Amino acid sequence: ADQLTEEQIAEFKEAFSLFDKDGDGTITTKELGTVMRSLGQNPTEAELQDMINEVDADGNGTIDFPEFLTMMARKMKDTDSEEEIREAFRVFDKDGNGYISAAELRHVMTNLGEKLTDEEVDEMIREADIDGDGQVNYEEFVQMMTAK
Ligand SMILES: [Ca+2]
Numbered sequence: 001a002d003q004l005t006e007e008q009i010a011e012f013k014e015a016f017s018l019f020d021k022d023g024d025g026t027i028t029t030k031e032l033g034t035v036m037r038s039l040g041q042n043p044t045e046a047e048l049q050d051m052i053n054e055v056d057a058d059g060n061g062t063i064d065f066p067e068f069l070t071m072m073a074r075k076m077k078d079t080d081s082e083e084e085i086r087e088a089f090r091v092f093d094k095d096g097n098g099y100i101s102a103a104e105l106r107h108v109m110t111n112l113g114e115k116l117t118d119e120e121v122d123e124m125i126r127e128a129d130i131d132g133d134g135q136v137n138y139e140e141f142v143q144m145m146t147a148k
């Protein structure tokens with residue numbers, strides 16, 4: 001589904017409180033980055049406050065529960081395993097040997113649902129593309145899909 005079930009909201013409520021250091025109803029930068037460090041990442045507060053601000057409904061820069069449900073919905077629907085990402089990466093890569101070229105990426109993301117033109121594909125790539133090679137790799141892909 002796109003919308004959450006009473007079981008998932010329940011648990012996104014149990015997670016919400018668990019994360020909260022003060023015990024209020026707002027998550028800060030500091031609170032969530034501590035979980036993000038334990039789940040294996042390492043953003044800074046700054047890199048946190050960025051993605052906080054985008055997803056803020058009210059605007060305030062602290063995370064309320066309907067914006068955690070909006071966050072974690074958008075997470076939990078998309079990501080399965082991480083293994084799902086990998087196999088879907090090497091579904092997208094036509095030959096399969098490494099990289100999804102601009103060409104390959106256009107065609108399969110156009111078959112998926114939004115129609116992309118050349119420059120729409122280039123632009124998706126370019127912001128994430130470290131080599132400047134015009135291809136999207138697995139770490140660039142995982143970075144790219146995270147962003148827009
Ligand atoms: Ca708090």
Ligand SMILES: [Ca+2]
Nearest residue numbers: 058060062064
């Ligand atoms: Ca807010």
Ligand SMILES: [Ca+2]
Nearest residue numbers: 094099100101
């Ligand atoms: Ca390829």
Ligand SMILES: [Ca+2]
Nearest residue numbers: 129130131135
């Ligand atoms: Ca690249």
